[PDB]
Amino acid sequence: SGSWLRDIWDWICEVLSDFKTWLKAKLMPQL
């Protein structure tokens, strides 16, 4: 047994910050 639920929680924290940068990177046109 272990803390699999918590393991995904921390992983989502990185994806949450990444999603914010991913949206800005995709919205940024060729410059």
Neighbours of 22 (CB within 10 A): 11
Classify residue 10 by burial, with Cβ atoms within 10 Å: 0-12, 13-18, 19+. exposed
The rounded distance, in Å, linking the Cα atoms of 22 and 4 is 26
How far is C-alpha 16 from the geometric centre of its chain's CA atoms?
A: 3
The rounded distance, in Å, linking the Cα atoms of 8 and 16 is 12
Retrieve residue 29's tokens.
Answer: 């046109």
Can you count the helices (H) and strands (E) in the chain?
1, 0
The rounded distance, in Å, linking the Cα atoms of 27 and 16 is 17
- In degrees and rounded to multiples of 5, residue 26 shows phi and psi of -75, -40
